[PDB]
Amino acid sequence: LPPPVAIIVGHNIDASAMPLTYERNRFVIDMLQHYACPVFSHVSSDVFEWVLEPFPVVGVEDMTAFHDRAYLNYLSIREALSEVDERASTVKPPLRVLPDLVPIPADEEYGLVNENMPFVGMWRTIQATVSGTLLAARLLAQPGRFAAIHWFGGRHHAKKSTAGGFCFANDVVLGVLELKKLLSSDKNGILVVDVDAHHGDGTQSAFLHDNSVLTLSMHAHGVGIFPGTGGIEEIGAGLGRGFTMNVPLPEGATDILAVTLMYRSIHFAFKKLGEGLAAIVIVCGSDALSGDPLGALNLTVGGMQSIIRLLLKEAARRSLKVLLLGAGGYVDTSCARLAGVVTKDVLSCAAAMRLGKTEYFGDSANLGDNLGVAVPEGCEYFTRYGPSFLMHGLPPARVSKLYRLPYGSPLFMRMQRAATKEALRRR
Numbered sequence: 001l002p003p004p005v006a007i008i009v010g011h012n013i014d015a016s017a018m019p020l021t022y023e024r025n026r027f028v029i030d031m032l033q034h035y036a037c038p039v040f041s042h043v044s045s046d047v048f049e050w051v052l053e054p055f056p057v058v059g060v061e062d063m064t065a066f067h068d069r070a071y072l073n074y075l076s077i078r079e080a081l082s083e084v085d086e087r088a089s090t091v092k093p094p095l096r097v098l099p100d101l102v103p104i105p106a107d108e109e110y111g112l113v114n115e116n117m118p119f120v121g122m123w124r125t126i127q128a129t130v131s132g133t134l135l136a137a138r139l140l141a142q143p144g145r146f147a148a149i150h151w152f153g154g155r156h157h158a159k160k161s162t163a164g165g166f167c168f169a170n171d172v173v174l175g176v177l178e179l180k181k182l183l184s185s186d187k188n189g190i191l192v193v194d195v196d197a198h199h200g201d202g203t204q205s206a207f208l209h210d211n212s213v214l215t216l217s218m219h220a221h222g223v224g225i226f227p228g229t230g231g232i233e234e235i236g237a238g239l240g241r242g243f244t245m246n247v248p249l250p251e252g253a254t255d256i257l258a259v260t261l262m263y264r265s266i267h268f269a270f271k272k273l274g275e276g277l278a279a280i281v282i283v284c285g286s287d288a289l290s291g292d293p294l295g296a297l298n299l300t301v302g303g304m305q306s307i308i309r310l311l312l313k314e315a316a317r318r319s320l321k322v323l324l325l326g327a328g329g330y331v332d333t334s335c336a337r338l339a340g341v342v343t344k345d346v347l348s349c350a351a352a353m354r355l356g357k358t359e360y361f362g363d364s365a366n367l368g369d370n371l372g373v374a375v376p377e378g379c380e381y382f383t384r385y386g387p388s389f390l391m392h393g394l395p396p397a398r399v400s401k402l403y404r405l406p407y408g409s410p411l412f413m414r415m416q417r418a419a420t421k422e423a424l425r426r427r
């Protein structure tokens with residue numbers, strides 16, 4: 001049997017890097033090597049496998065399981081269809097990377113505009129992302145495997161024939177689909193939990209009518225919060241009714257709202273899926289963390305870790321498979337801090353399972369109550385983790401903290417109907 005955790009890295013960690021978060025993969029892998037991995041090493045380990053090859057060469061045919069073929073064909077040749085925008089680029093070769101292309105009218109049909117402007121290398125970064133997630137899904141389906149971790153994937157906004165929010169191919173959907181065909185036909189329900197600060201609209205649209213994939217998204221929601229969808233009334237369609245869950249949060253929400261509500265929704269989702277549940281895929285963005293410039297929430301590292309600990313614990317008990325993906329996140333150090341403690345939790349949990357234990361997190365500090373964990377001084381990027389140099393440290397809040405739902409909140413009202421039909425039945 002292989003090590004129960006596969007950490008999908010690849011040989012060029014910049015392959016999937018995007019122009020706005022170009023350095024982020026480096027912070028994440030650095031934090032994994034110096035915070036999460038050592039305690040389970042002796043690199044060699046019986047807990048995790050550091051995957052660096054082979055990455056399948058993927059093309060249009062490995063993405064048609066979800067995406068419209070004309071859309072994919074266009075992405076795969078778009079860099080041949082116009083010149084680099086040299087007015088937009090004040091720094092010239094050899095000191096530039098991934099520059100914007102000049103737009104063409106055909107970009108409009110496929111949403112390749114604004115934040116999804118095409119750039120040189122875009123098809124290669126799409127290939128790296130999809131390839132990594134497909135490899136992670138295939139390794140996860142092997143026996144003896146508890147989890148596969150691809151911090152570089154998780155482009156949850158892409159739709160069947162539209163790009164959006166920096167996502168072109170939806171490797172979440174493609175990863176769920178590849179997992180789906182490789183799991184036993186007796187047990188292959190999938191729960192996908194999306195704790196990125198933005199509505200997982202691509203993923204939800206791919207499974208709106210499906211009752212074998214339950215999509216649960218936590219996200220900020222409000223006027224001028226991207227992408228605009230994800231209200232409490234989106235509950236699915238047809239056979240899929242009841243298998244789409246949204247937890248839309250007020251801008252600035254803290255752990256006391258987000259964590260409480262996600263715990264409540266996750267337990268509902270476990271129930272709606274019952275014993276057919278086989279795998280959980282976690283889309284773990286770090287832009288919900290307080291201080292993020294684009295996410296408009298105020299979660300703590302400990303709060304995000306807490307949500308994910310509930311999913312890991314349930315997967316360990318019932319012997320499920322876990323596919324962990326990254327997503328958004330626009331502070332490099334917050335992204336690596338979060339990736340570090342979530343990964344250490346996954347390893348600690350898998351190590352506990354192989355020893356027969358029922359206490360899963362004994363090797364990984366709980367940042368919700370331990371505010372003294374230091375960033376490893378061996379981190380290459382260590383000097384960036386100030387002023388605290390602690391694993392829970394976050395930049396000052398960009399939006400005011402909210403601890404109570406606003407007056408009139410439809411989230412509260414939906415609780416209200418149910419939350420009093422509870423105390424009534426218990427009487």
Ligand SMILES: O=C(/C=C/c1cccc2c1oc1ccccc12)NO
Nearest residue numbers: 115165166196198226294327328329
């Ligand atoms: O990270 C993401 C995507 C974030 C994003 C992409 C494009 C535009 C905006 C984005 O966020 C915004 C907030 C306010 C106004 C505009 C935007 N998805 O997971």
Ligand SMILES: [K+]
Nearest residue numbers: 194196198218
């Ligand atoms: K989300």
Ligand SMILES: [K+]
Nearest residue numbers: 207210213243
């Ligand atoms: K669904």
Ligand SMILES: [Zn+2]
Nearest residue numbers: 196197198328
């Ligand atoms: Zn996001």
